[PDB]
Amino acid sequence: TYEAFVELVERLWEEVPEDFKRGLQGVHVFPEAKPEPGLEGVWRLGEYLDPGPPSAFGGFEDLGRHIALYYGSFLEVAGEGFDWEAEVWETMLHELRHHLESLAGRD
Numbered sequence: 001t002y003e004a005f006v007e008l009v010e011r012l013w014e015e016v017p018e019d020f021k022r023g024l025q026g027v028h029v030f031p032e033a034k035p036e037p038g039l040e041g042v043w044r045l046g047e048y049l050d051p052g053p054p055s056a057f058g059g060f061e062d063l064g065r066h067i068a069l070y071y072g073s074f075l076e077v078a079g080e081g082f083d084w085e086a087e088v089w090e091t092m093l094h095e096l097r098h099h100l101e102s103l104a105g106r107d
Contacts (some may be wrong), residue, residue, distance in 0.1 A: 002031050005071050005084070012089055016096065025064035026094065026097050033072025045071035046091040047097035065102070068097040 006029050013027050028049075036042040046069045051060035069091060074084075
């Protein structure tokens with residue numbers, strides 16, 4: 001269920017060392033699925049939400065940095081023996097890697 005998925009994400013997220021989360025507001029979980037644009041049959045399990053470069057009128061850091069997870073994408077790809085814990089673990093930490101690389105790139 002979606003509730004159980006959210007609970008799994010938070011439980012795994014808490015295992016993640018606090019210092020790796022510096023500059024990151026948190027993980028967002030959405031019920032919807034997200035196809036990988038153009039290249040069908042492939043679903044995006046998650047992604048890093050990057051404020052990006054400033055505009056002429058101001059930067060976007062106030063939006064914060066987030067990792068998004070798409071529950072619907074997990075369902076689409078899930079089949080017999082789907083390791084929920086292994087899949088969430090990998091997706092989160094992979095996006096957390098993007099967060100670290102994004103910070104190092106502005107520092």
